[PDB]
Amino acid sequence: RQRRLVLVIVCVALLLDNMLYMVIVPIVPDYIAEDVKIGVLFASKAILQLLVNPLSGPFIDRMSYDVPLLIGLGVMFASTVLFAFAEDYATLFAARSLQGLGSAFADTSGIAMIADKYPEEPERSRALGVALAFISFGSLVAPPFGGILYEFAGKRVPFLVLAAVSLFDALLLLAVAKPFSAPVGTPIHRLMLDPYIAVVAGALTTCNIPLAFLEPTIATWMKHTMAASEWEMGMAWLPAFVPHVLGVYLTVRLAARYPHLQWLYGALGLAVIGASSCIVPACRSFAPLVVSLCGLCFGIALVDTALLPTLAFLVDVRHVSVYGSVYAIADISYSVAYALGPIVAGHIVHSLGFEQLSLGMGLANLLYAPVLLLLRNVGLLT
């Protein structure tokens, strides 16, 4: 028990958190439906994640990661009960913005708590891997079932049930950890100018471009002239979970036998992601495409559970020992591709076609692994 009971509560608060940013995409254009106006609504979540994260950086490391987590959970509960009482454009826009703010306040605090409660070499990696696996189980296998549940019942009862469950989890966390009972960190604008952190931030912002750009342009490529039914459009990302957990487990296991090596895994993951992005075109069948998607999803875990604890290690070694405003920088890095995707992907696909942007993403991905080589002396720093 002890610290382990908190980890389960935080992890579940992230599984249901990622369920909602991706169960509303197929629901939006059943009400409003000239296509540029609907693009901004889908980009509202990531836009607010860039204008609140720098302001919420120093906020997190000032009151021990509890009040920000509770604030984020409350805001997201408020935003969940608003998606089910909405039919017009403005209400959905406001709900999406509130969801983005709640994510920006909650995910960083949860990751910081997980990193703080497990200070050690062989346990922090395991905790972060568990958190990432719980995130992936909510982000990659849930929306297929949520779509069927909405098609059967609707959008009122399930969303209210989700809000009730989120409130239950928040109340459980409040009862377990009591914040209302009787170290100056490094600011972001000076933490950014670190040669050993900018590379990691760039790798994080580069390893997430293919996921942000494949959606929502993969459906119009599946249905267009290649034998696409309706099941194999929502069931094309579900068999993409086993490689992810396998990669997370493999990287966590290999991070213990070899302690020094924490850049080779990132380079290999980036290479795999680039190769998968390059090979995703030119597959005139469902099975090769789903295999390429499997490889693409597997490559991301290698980068994630090899460059996520590296930030904590660096901020502990050559800075002050507070775990905040660093995962905020990581979140800023991660929330740029998702902001740039649903607005530029359609234009790029219409102009150059779904055969050159994929190679461009692959070439960009295979141009940073050499850059990730300036992380060879980490662990020797004194």
Tab-separated table of C-alpha atoms in Angstrom:
chain	number	residue	atom	x	y	z
A	1	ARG	CA	0.000	0.000	0.000
A	2	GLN	CA	1.381	3.376	1.139
A	3	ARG	CA	2.383	5.111	-2.099
A	4	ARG	CA	0.929	2.333	-4.293
A	5	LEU	CA	-2.676	3.210	-3.414
A	6	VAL	CA	-2.213	6.768	-4.697
A	7	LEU	CA	-0.732	5.525	-7.984
A	8	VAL	CA	-3.868	3.541	-8.853
A	9	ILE	CA	-6.099	6.555	-8.163
A	10	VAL	CA	-3.953	8.841	-10.327
A	11	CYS	CA	-3.696	6.254	-13.115
A	12	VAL	CA	-7.470	5.755	-13.282
A	13	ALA	CA	-7.910	9.540	-13.297
A	14	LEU	CA	-5.866	9.514	-16.529
A	15	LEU	CA	-7.613	6.580	-18.231
A	16	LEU	CA	-10.986	8.323	-17.994
A	17	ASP	CA	-9.278	11.621	-18.832
A	18	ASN	CA	-8.065	10.491	-22.265
A	19	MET	CA	-11.382	8.739	-22.940
A	20	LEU	CA	-13.025	12.157	-23.343
A	21	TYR	CA	-10.695	13.905	-25.642
A	22	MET	CA	-11.236	11.171	-28.170
A	23	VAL	CA	-14.874	9.987	-27.735
A	24	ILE	CA	-16.252	13.361	-28.990
A	25	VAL	CA	-14.551	13.529	-32.406
A	26	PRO	CA	-17.181	11.447	-34.296
A	27	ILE	CA	-20.018	13.088	-32.323
A	28	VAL	CA	-19.283	16.724	-33.250
A	29	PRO	CA	-20.168	16.672	-36.973
A	30	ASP	CA	-23.529	14.994	-36.390
A	31	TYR	CA	-25.044	18.275	-35.138
A	32	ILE	CA	-23.606	21.355	-36.870
A	33	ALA	CA	-23.236	19.718	-40.300
A	34	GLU	CA	-17.408	25.755	-44.597
A	35	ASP	CA	-15.165	22.991	-43.248
A	36	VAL	CA	-12.554	25.421	-41.900
A	37	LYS	CA	-14.893	26.583	-39.120
A	38	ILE	CA	-15.209	23.048	-37.730
A	39	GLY	CA	-11.427	22.608	-37.765
A	40	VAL	CA	-10.801	25.264	-35.116
A	41	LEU	CA	-13.230	23.608	-32.689
A	42	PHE	CA	-11.165	20.408	-32.737
A	43	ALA	CA	-7.993	22.474	-32.208
A	44	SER	CA	-9.390	24.340	-29.188
A	45	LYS	CA	-8.090	21.727	-26.732
A	46	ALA	CA	-4.458	22.089	-27.794
A	47	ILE	CA	-4.627	25.876	-28.235
A	48	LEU	CA	-5.500	26.444	-24.575
A	49	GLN	CA	-2.810	23.935	-23.572
A	50	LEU	CA	-0.227	26.370	-24.987
A	51	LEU	CA	-1.578	29.586	-23.418
A	52	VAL	CA	-2.073	28.181	-19.897
A	53	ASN	CA	0.902	25.848	-19.480
A	54	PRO	CA	3.583	28.595	-19.207
A	55	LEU	CA	1.358	30.372	-16.676
A	56	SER	CA	0.662	27.135	-14.767
A	57	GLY	CA	4.309	26.042	-14.648
A	58	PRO	CA	5.427	27.875	-11.507
A	59	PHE	CA	1.913	27.323	-10.126
A	60	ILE	CA	2.337	23.549	-9.791
A	61	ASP	CA	5.608	23.433	-7.838
A	62	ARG	CA	4.329	25.808	-5.137
A	63	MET	CA	1.707	23.716	-3.280
A	64	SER	CA	2.816	20.080	-3.524
A	65	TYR	CA	0.833	19.019	-6.611
A	66	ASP	CA	-2.455	18.435	-4.718
A	67	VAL	CA	-4.506	21.609	-5.203
A	68	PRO	CA	-3.704	21.765	-8.961
A	69	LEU	CA	-4.786	18.132	-9.363
A	70	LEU	CA	-8.065	18.765	-7.542
A	71	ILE	CA	-8.649	21.938	-9.580
A	72	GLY	CA	-8.076	20.055	-12.825
A	73	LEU	CA	-10.396	17.222	-11.820
A	74	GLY	CA	-13.116	19.688	-10.827
A	75	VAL	CA	-12.810	21.656	-14.064
A	76	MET	CA	-12.948	18.455	-16.107
A	77	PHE	CA	-16.021	17.281	-14.190
A	78	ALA	CA	-17.611	20.642	-15.006
A	79	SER	CA	-16.668	20.249	-18.688
A	80	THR	CA	-17.976	16.666	-18.879
A	81	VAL	CA	-21.489	17.612	-17.697
A	82	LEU	CA	-21.495	20.358	-20.333
A	83	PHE	CA	-20.866	18.095	-23.365
A	84	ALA	CA	-24.155	16.303	-22.594
A	85	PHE	CA	-26.245	19.479	-22.333
A	86	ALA	CA	-25.013	20.969	-25.603
A	87	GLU	CA	-26.396	21.175	-29.131
A	88	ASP	CA	-25.135	24.498	-30.579
A	89	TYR	CA	-21.692	25.474	-31.872
A	90	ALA	CA	-20.748	27.929	-29.112
A	91	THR	CA	-21.594	25.550	-26.264
A	92	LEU	CA	-19.465	22.771	-27.760
A	93	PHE	CA	-16.615	25.239	-28.320
A	94	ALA	CA	-16.752	26.322	-24.674
A	95	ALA	CA	-16.898	22.700	-23.511
A	96	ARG	CA	-13.846	21.772	-25.594
A	97	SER	CA	-11.905	24.763	-24.250
A	98	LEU	CA	-12.821	23.816	-20.676
A	99	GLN	CA	-11.661	20.256	-21.363
A	100	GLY	CA	-8.339	21.597	-22.622
A	101	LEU	CA	-7.873	23.745	-19.523
A	102	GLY	CA	-8.703	20.801	-17.267
A	103	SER	CA	-6.190	18.615	-19.094
A	104	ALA	CA	-3.483	21.275	-18.813
A	105	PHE	CA	-4.114	21.562	-15.073
A	106	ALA	CA	-4.476	17.834	-14.309
A	107	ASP	CA	-2.125	15.754	-16.488
A	108	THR	CA	1.017	17.663	-15.498
A	109	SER	CA	0.137	17.485	-11.799
A	110	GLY	CA	-0.537	13.752	-12.015
A	111	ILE	CA	2.749	13.045	-13.786
A	112	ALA	CA	4.610	15.230	-11.281
A	113	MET	CA	3.027	13.371	-8.358
A	114	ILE	CA	3.949	9.995	-9.853
A	115	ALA	CA	7.539	11.143	-10.383
A	116	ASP	CA	7.806	12.640	-6.885
A	117	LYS	CA	6.357	9.739	-4.894
A	118	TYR	CA	8.886	7.264	-6.389
A	119	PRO	CA	12.386	8.762	-6.103
A	120	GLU	CA	14.738	5.959	-7.209
A	121	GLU	CA	16.299	4.474	-10.333
A	122	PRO	CA	14.489	1.097	-10.670
A	123	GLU	CA	11.032	2.276	-9.512
A	124	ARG	CA	10.415	5.650	-11.179
A	125	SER	CA	10.683	4.051	-14.623
A	126	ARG	CA	8.195	1.341	-13.640
A	127	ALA	CA	5.729	3.897	-12.267
A	128	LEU	CA	5.953	6.083	-15.375
A	129	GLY	CA	5.533	3.029	-17.601
A	130	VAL	CA	2.404	2.021	-15.695
A	131	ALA	CA	1.039	5.551	-16.097
A	132	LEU	CA	1.752	5.542	-19.842
A	133	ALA	CA	0.137	2.122	-20.306
A	134	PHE	CA	-2.967	3.330	-18.459
A	135	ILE	CA	-3.034	6.425	-20.690
A	136	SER	CA	-2.772	4.296	-23.836
A	137	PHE	CA	-5.552	1.957	-22.705
A	138	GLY	CA	-7.833	4.981	-22.447
A	139	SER	CA	-6.635	6.644	-25.635
A	140	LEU	CA	-6.457	3.732	-28.108
A	141	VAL	CA	-9.037	1.040	-27.249
A	142	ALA	CA	-11.921	2.969	-25.618
A	143	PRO	CA	-13.394	5.194	-28.404
A	144	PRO	CA	-14.347	2.159	-30.538
A	145	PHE	CA	-16.558	0.947	-27.677
A	146	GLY	CA	-17.760	4.443	-26.806
A	147	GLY	CA	-19.034	4.908	-30.346
A	148	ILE	CA	-21.184	1.783	-30.131
A	149	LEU	CA	-22.419	2.772	-26.667
A	150	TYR	CA	-23.441	6.208	-27.961
A	151	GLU	CA	-25.105	4.644	-31.011
A	152	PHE	CA	-27.149	2.431	-28.681
A	153	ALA	CA	-28.062	4.772	-25.810
A	154	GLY	CA	-27.090	8.353	-26.629
A	155	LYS	CA	-24.921	11.154	-25.284
A	156	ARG	CA	-26.787	12.111	-22.083
A	157	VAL	CA	-26.656	9.075	-19.776
A	158	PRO	CA	-23.073	7.915	-20.584
A	159	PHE	CA	-21.588	11.381	-20.074
A	160	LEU	CA	-23.413	11.848	-16.766
A	161	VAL	CA	-22.152	8.426	-15.655
A	162	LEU	CA	-18.607	9.427	-16.623
A	163	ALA	CA	-18.961	12.673	-14.659
A	164	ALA	CA	-20.187	10.747	-11.614
A	165	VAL	CA	-17.254	8.327	-11.839
A	166	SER	CA	-14.769	11.198	-12.171
A	167	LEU	CA	-16.300	12.900	-9.126
A	168	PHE	CA	-16.060	9.609	-7.224
A	169	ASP	CA	-12.358	9.325	-8.076
A	170	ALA	CA	-11.739	12.939	-7.044
A	171	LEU	CA	-13.520	12.366	-3.727
A	172	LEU	CA	-11.508	9.186	-3.141
A	173	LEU	CA	-8.248	11.052	-3.763
A	174	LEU	CA	-9.338	13.871	-1.445
A	175	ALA	CA	-10.201	11.378	1.300
A	176	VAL	CA	-6.935	9.456	0.894
A	177	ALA	CA	-4.552	12.435	0.692
A	178	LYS	CA	-5.449	15.407	2.886
A	179	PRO	CA	-4.085	18.741	1.592
A	180	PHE	CA	-6.083	20.903	4.020
A	181	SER	CA	-4.106	19.883	7.113
A	182	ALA	CA	-1.766	21.889	9.332
A	183	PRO	CA	12.565	25.073	-2.473
A	184	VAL	CA	12.490	27.858	-5.067
A	185	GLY	CA	12.289	26.080	-8.404
A	186	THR	CA	13.966	27.144	-11.620
A	187	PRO	CA	11.628	29.272	-13.774
A	188	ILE	CA	10.703	28.014	-17.227
A	189	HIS	CA	12.118	31.003	-19.116
A	190	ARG	CA	15.572	30.134	-17.744
A	191	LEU	CA	15.088	26.348	-17.693
A	192	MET	CA	14.483	26.285	-21.455
A	193	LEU	CA	18.046	27.448	-22.213
A	194	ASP	CA	19.498	24.048	-21.308
A	195	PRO	CA	21.339	22.081	-24.032
A	196	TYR	CA	20.313	18.764	-22.430
A	197	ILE	CA	16.595	19.625	-22.229
A	198	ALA	CA	15.873	21.309	-25.586
A	199	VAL	CA	16.916	18.140	-27.426
A	200	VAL	CA	14.482	16.055	-25.365
A	201	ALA	CA	11.717	18.606	-25.940
A	202	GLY	CA	12.336	18.526	-29.689
A	203	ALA	CA	12.307	14.731	-29.714
A	204	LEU	CA	8.996	14.758	-27.837
A	205	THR	CA	7.454	17.275	-30.251
A	206	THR	CA	8.759	15.314	-33.256
A	207	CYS	CA	7.714	11.780	-32.160
A	208	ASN	CA	4.060	12.924	-31.917
A	209	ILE	CA	3.600	14.450	-35.391
A	210	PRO	CA	2.510	11.218	-37.178
A	211	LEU	CA	-0.270	10.493	-34.676
A	212	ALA	CA	-1.555	14.070	-34.871
A	213	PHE	CA	-1.428	14.104	-38.683
A	214	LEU	CA	-2.831	10.658	-39.535
A	215	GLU	CA	-6.090	11.639	-37.880
A	216	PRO	CA	-8.485	12.641	-39.327
A	217	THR	CA	-7.015	12.096	-42.812
A	218	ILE	CA	-6.744	8.299	-42.606
A	219	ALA	CA	-10.499	7.761	-43.041
A	220	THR	CA	-10.696	9.699	-46.318
A	221	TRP	CA	-7.754	7.601	-47.552
A	222	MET	CA	-9.264	4.285	-46.444
A	223	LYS	CA	-12.685	4.942	-47.972
A	224	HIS	CA	-11.277	6.422	-51.204
A	225	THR	CA	-11.114	3.575	-53.771
A	226	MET	CA	-9.691	0.821	-51.479
A	227	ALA	CA	-12.431	-1.611	-50.468
A	228	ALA	CA	-13.263	0.098	-47.161
A	229	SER	CA	-16.231	-1.071	-45.106
A	230	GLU	CA	-17.532	0.681	-41.988
A	231	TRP	CA	-16.108	-1.723	-39.395
A	232	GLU	CA	-12.519	-1.345	-40.641
A	233	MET	CA	-12.454	2.406	-40.031
A	234	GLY	CA	-13.147	2.404	-36.295
A	235	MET	CA	-11.537	-1.014	-35.788
A	236	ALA	CA	-8.207	-0.031	-37.378
A	237	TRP	CA	-6.623	1.486	-34.238
A	238	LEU	CA	-7.823	-1.078	-31.681
A	239	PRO	CA	-5.282	-3.785	-32.659
A	240	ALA	CA	-2.584	-1.199	-31.875
A	241	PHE	CA	-2.437	-1.701	-28.111
A	242	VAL	CA	-0.496	-4.942	-27.633
A	243	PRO	CA	2.651	-3.545	-29.340
A	244	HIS	CA	2.409	-0.437	-27.139
A	245	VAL	CA	2.331	-2.303	-23.821
A	246	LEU	CA	4.957	-4.733	-25.119
A	247	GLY	CA	7.260	-1.833	-25.966
A	248	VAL	CA	6.669	-0.154	-22.605
A	249	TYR	CA	7.429	-3.389	-20.750
A	250	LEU	CA	10.516	-4.102	-22.859
A	251	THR	CA	11.951	-0.615	-22.368
A	252	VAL	CA	11.279	-0.680	-18.616
A	253	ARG	CA	12.938	-4.098	-18.332
A	254	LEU	CA	15.958	-3.040	-20.399
A	255	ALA	CA	16.374	0.220	-18.464
A	256	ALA	CA	17.295	-1.755	-15.327
A	257	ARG	CA	19.921	-4.130	-16.740
A	258	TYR	CA	21.677	-1.235	-18.509
A	259	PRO	CA	21.422	1.960	-16.414
A	260	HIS	CA	23.574	4.230	-18.575
A	261	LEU	CA	21.740	3.551	-21.850
A	262	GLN	CA	18.761	5.909	-22.052
A	263	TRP	CA	19.387	7.445	-25.500
A	264	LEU	CA	19.769	4.327	-27.654
A	265	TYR	CA	16.169	3.358	-26.893
A	266	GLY	CA	14.967	6.812	-27.920
A	267	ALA	CA	16.974	6.712	-31.145
A	268	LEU	CA	15.641	3.245	-31.994
A	269	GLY	CA	12.082	4.350	-31.260
A	270	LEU	CA	12.433	7.401	-33.487
A	271	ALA	CA	13.880	5.238	-36.268
A	272	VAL	CA	11.011	2.743	-35.984
A	273	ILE	CA	8.446	5.562	-36.008
A	274	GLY	CA	10.016	7.100	-39.106
A	275	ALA	CA	10.169	3.784	-40.951
A	276	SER	CA	6.531	3.048	-40.091
A	277	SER	CA	5.445	6.504	-41.265
A	278	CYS	CA	7.353	5.985	-44.515
A	279	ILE	CA	5.847	2.531	-45.133
A	280	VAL	CA	2.232	3.430	-44.209
A	281	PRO	CA	1.537	4.498	-47.829
A	282	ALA	CA	1.304	1.807	-50.510
A	283	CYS	CA	-0.631	-0.924	-48.691
A	284	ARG	CA	-3.710	-1.942	-50.694
A	285	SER	CA	-5.207	-4.041	-47.895
A	286	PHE	CA	-6.327	-3.848	-44.281
A	287	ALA	CA	-3.743	-6.201	-42.749
A	288	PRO	CA	-0.534	-4.478	-43.985
A	289	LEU	CA	-1.957	-1.098	-42.979
A	290	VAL	CA	-2.850	-2.310	-39.490
A	291	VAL	CA	0.630	-3.851	-39.182
A	292	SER	CA	2.214	-0.518	-40.112
A	293	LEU	CA	-0.022	1.162	-37.527
A	294	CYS	CA	1.147	-1.425	-34.984
A	295	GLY	CA	4.760	-0.522	-35.713
A	296	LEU	CA	3.990	3.199	-35.550
A	297	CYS	CA	2.339	2.834	-32.140
A	298	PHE	CA	5.084	0.531	-30.840
A	299	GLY	CA	7.808	3.006	-31.772
A	300	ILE	CA	6.277	5.790	-29.677
A	301	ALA	CA	6.474	3.890	-26.376
A	302	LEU	CA	10.223	3.389	-26.810
A	303	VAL	CA	10.739	7.156	-26.988
A	304	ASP	CA	8.231	7.925	-24.229
A	305	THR	CA	9.417	5.542	-21.517
A	306	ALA	CA	13.018	6.474	-22.230
A	307	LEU	CA	12.834	10.285	-22.404
A	308	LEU	CA	10.196	10.852	-19.722
A	309	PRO	CA	12.336	9.935	-16.659
A	310	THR	CA	15.359	11.603	-18.282
A	311	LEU	CA	13.844	15.037	-17.628
A	312	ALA	CA	13.420	14.222	-13.933
A	313	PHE	CA	16.964	12.848	-13.756
A	314	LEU	CA	18.433	15.983	-15.347
A	315	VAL	CA	16.403	18.400	-13.217
A	316	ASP	CA	17.526	16.450	-10.144
A	317	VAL	CA	21.199	16.374	-11.139
A	318	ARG	CA	21.935	19.850	-12.516
A	319	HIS	CA	19.057	21.888	-11.050
A	320	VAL	CA	16.896	22.106	-7.937
A	321	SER	CA	14.990	19.008	-6.836
A	322	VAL	CA	11.379	19.896	-7.568
A	323	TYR	CA	9.410	18.031	-10.248
A	324	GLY	CA	7.432	20.827	-11.849
A	325	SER	CA	7.506	23.102	-14.881
A	326	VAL	CA	9.559	20.385	-16.605
A	327	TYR	CA	6.675	18.071	-17.397
A	328	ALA	CA	4.891	21.328	-18.237
A	329	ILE	CA	7.572	21.914	-20.881
A	330	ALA	CA	7.063	18.332	-22.057
A	331	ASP	CA	3.309	18.963	-22.321
A	332	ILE	CA	3.936	22.167	-24.291
A	333	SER	CA	6.147	20.148	-26.637
A	334	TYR	CA	3.469	17.453	-26.982
A	335	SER	CA	0.578	19.898	-27.538
A	336	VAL	CA	1.985	21.593	-30.659
A	337	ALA	CA	1.458	18.804	-33.192
A	338	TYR	CA	-2.115	18.332	-31.966
A	339	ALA	CA	-2.709	22.066	-32.423
A	340	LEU	CA	-1.205	22.117	-35.927
A	341	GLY	CA	-2.807	18.891	-37.177
A	342	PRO	CA	-6.557	19.358	-37.675
A	343	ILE	CA	-6.004	22.728	-39.394
A	344	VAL	CA	-3.133	22.013	-41.826
A	345	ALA	CA	-3.513	18.271	-42.530
A	346	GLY	CA	-6.554	18.714	-44.767
A	347	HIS	CA	-4.919	21.477	-46.801
A	348	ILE	CA	-1.714	19.457	-47.207
A	349	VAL	CA	-3.594	16.312	-48.249
A	350	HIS	CA	-5.716	18.249	-50.747
A	351	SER	CA	-2.662	19.964	-52.249
A	352	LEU	CA	0.134	17.368	-52.325
A	353	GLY	CA	-1.831	14.169	-51.663
A	354	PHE	CA	-1.547	11.445	-49.049
A	355	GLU	CA	1.763	10.227	-50.465
A	356	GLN	CA	4.279	13.056	-49.871
A	357	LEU	CA	3.418	14.332	-46.389
A	358	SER	CA	3.986	10.797	-45.091
A	359	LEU	CA	7.485	10.694	-46.587
A	360	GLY	CA	8.142	14.187	-45.247
A	361	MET	CA	7.176	13.102	-41.736
A	362	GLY	CA	9.319	9.983	-42.086
A	363	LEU	CA	12.336	11.984	-43.247
A	364	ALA	CA	11.887	14.475	-40.404
A	365	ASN	CA	11.653	11.578	-37.944
A	366	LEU	CA	14.848	10.081	-39.392
A	367	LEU	CA	16.718	13.359	-38.865
A	368	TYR	CA	16.613	13.647	-35.066
A	369	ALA	CA	18.027	10.286	-33.983
A	370	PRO	CA	21.529	11.611	-34.810
A	371	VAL	CA	20.617	14.723	-32.788
A	372	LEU	CA	19.709	12.472	-29.827
A	373	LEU	CA	23.398	11.475	-29.666
A	374	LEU	CA	24.303	14.490	-27.497
A	375	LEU	CA	23.009	12.541	-24.496
A	376	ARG	CA	25.922	10.126	-24.131
A	377	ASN	CA	27.585	11.554	-21.005
A	378	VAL	CA	24.423	11.595	-18.867
A	379	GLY	CA	24.949	9.602	-15.691
A	380	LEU	CA	28.564	10.778	-15.489
A	381	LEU	CA	27.588	14.318	-14.454
A	382	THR	CA	28.663	15.165	-10.913
